[PDB]
Amino acid sequence: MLTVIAEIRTRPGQHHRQAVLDQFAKIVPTVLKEEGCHGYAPMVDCAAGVSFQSMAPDSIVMIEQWESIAHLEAHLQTPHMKAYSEAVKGDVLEMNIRILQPG
Amino acid sequence: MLTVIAEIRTRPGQHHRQAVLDQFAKIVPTVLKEEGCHGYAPMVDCAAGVSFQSMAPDSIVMIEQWESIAHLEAHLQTPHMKAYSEAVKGDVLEMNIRILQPG
């Protein structure tokens, strides 16, 4: 019912962003079997060469679906997320979490 | 293959945002039958009362899926979109279009 778009801003420069994606590669199959999870995808800009596109190369955009706030809050306490957090602490600068519903 | 997240910033105040949503209510079934379209949903913040959530009440976030850039570019020239644009010109301030792929 809830869609989460979390933008993760990574440190510029030498594979900070790929290191974050590599952490996601380890965890996404597990997140996706989490209870309440109907989607969890780390997306990056695709350069399309069109004027109307905005790009942000030090950015990963997470598109997620969660059945409820309770399920999202359990998700954040799971071990794979505390492990992720620990592993990316030198590569991430911030994360902006929106929680959305059909408008 | 392509995911578009377009954030539409509406003018603050008396139902500018609802007027935009009402335009979307007319067009979304049609957009969704467009060729190349595997999703087209106007989302708004759900107040969740949690510290980590960022909210933006004069914002609509479009989450879309398009088979290609050619299909997205045709979409923008369709009559329902030129009609939408015309109808919302006094309610919208800007639109930030990201075009994303799996990272």
Side-chain angles (χ1 to χ4, degrees):
Chain A
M1 203 226 251
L2 303 184
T3 303
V4 168
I5 293 175
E7 180 158 10
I8 292 167
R9 167 176 201 255
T10 48
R11 219 178 258 278
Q14 212 237 341
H15 37 84
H16 287 295
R17 193 236 243 177
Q18 185 62 53
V20 183
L21 293 164
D22 290 342
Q23 299 297 316
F24 277 111
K26 309 197 306 176
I27 300 303
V28 162
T30 299
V31 169
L32 281 173
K33 278 172 335 206
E34 276 177 61
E35 195 190 316
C37 188
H38 302 263
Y40 196 78
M43 306 300 190
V44 295
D45 301 303
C46 171
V50 305
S51 62
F52 58 90
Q53 179 176 17
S54 313
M55 291 196 82
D58 294 334
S59 120
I60 288 163
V61 179
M62 303 298 304
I63 306 172
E64 314 176 20
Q65 299 193 95
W66 292 97
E67 282 170 35
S68 57
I69 172 75
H71 294 270
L72 180 55
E73 281 173 328
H75 161 258
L76 293 169
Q77 300 309 138
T78 59
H80 51 92
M81 299 305 140
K82 294 208 192 101
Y84 159 89
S85 303
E86 178 71 16
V88 301
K89 63 174 163 208
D91 309 292
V92 169
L93 292 184
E94 67 166 346
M95 186 160 50
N96 182 250
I97 299 176
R98 317 227 10 217
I99 307 184
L100 301 169
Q101 66 189 346
Chain B
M1 203 226 251
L2 303 184
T3 303
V4 168
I5 293 175
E7 180 158 10
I8 292 167
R9 167 176 201 255
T10 48
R11 219 178 258 278
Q14 212 237 341
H15 37 84
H16 287 295
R17 193 236 243 177
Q18 185 62 53
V20 183
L21 293 164
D22 290 342
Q23 299 297 316
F24 277 111
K26 309 197 306 176
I27 300 303
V28 162
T30 299
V31 169
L32 281 173
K33 278 172 335 206
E34 276 177 61
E35 195 190 316
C37 188
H38 302 263
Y40 196 78
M43 306 300 190
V44 295
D45 301 303
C46 171
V50 305
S51 62
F52 58 90
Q53 179 176 17
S54 313
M55 291 196 82
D58 294 334
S59 120
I60 288 163
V61 179
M62 303 298 304
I63 306 172
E64 314 176 20
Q65 299 193 95
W66 292 97
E67 282 170 35
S68 57
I69 172 75
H71 294 270
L72 180 55
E73 281 173 328
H75 161 258
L76 293 169
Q77 300 309 138
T78 59
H80 51 92
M81 299 305 140
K82 294 208 192 101
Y84 159 89
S85 303
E86 178 71 16
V88 301
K89 63 174 163 208
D91 309 292
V92 169
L93 292 184
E94 67 166 346
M95 186 160 50
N96 182 250
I97 299 176
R98 317 227 10 217
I99 307 184
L100 301 169
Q101 66 189 346

